[PDB]
């Protein structure tokens, strides 16, 4: 067989769809650009961090 495992996900953690997803520079989670909190639009310049990390 095979491990069949990966470090980071490959699906939105809000709507769960296919396509390009953002990556966090800390944890191992992915979030769309419109499915954020707060929501995003363009490429968030500078070290970006998901709202799940900044929060407890
Ligand atoms: Zn989404
Ligand atoms: Zn994170």
What are the E-state strand segments in the chain? 22-23, 30-31
Task: Say which residues have a Cβ less than 8 Å from residue 11's Cβ, sequence separation at least 6.
Answer: 17, 18, 21, 30
Phi–psi pair at 28, nearest 5 degrees: -120, 70
Query: Cβ(30)–Cβ(9) under 8 Å?
Result: yes
47 token code pair: 């070290």
Q: Tell how far the Cα of 13 is from the centroid of ligand 1, in angstroms.
A: 7
Domains of the chain: 1-56 (3.30.40.10)
Question: From which experimental method does this structure derive?
Answer: NMR
Nearest to 23 by CA among 1, 2, 52, 3: 52
Alpha-carbon distance of 12 to 47, in angstroms, equals 20
Query: Cβ(38)–Cβ(14) under 8 Å?
Result: no
9 token code pair: 């996900």
Chain centroid to CA 37: how far?
A: 11
- CB atoms closer than 10 angstroms to residue 13: 14
Around ion ligand 2, residues with a beta carbon closer than 5 Å are: 24, 26-27, 50, 53
Cα radius of gyration rounded to whole Å, the chain = 12
């Amino acid at each position: 067989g095979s491990s069949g495992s990966s470090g980071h996900e490959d699906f939105c953690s809000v709507c769960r769809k296919s396509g390009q997803l953002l990556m966090c520079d800390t944890c191992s989670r992915v979030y769309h650009l419109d499915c954020l909190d707060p929501p995003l639009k363009t490429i968030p310049k500078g070290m970006w961090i998901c709202p799940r990390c900044q929060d407890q």
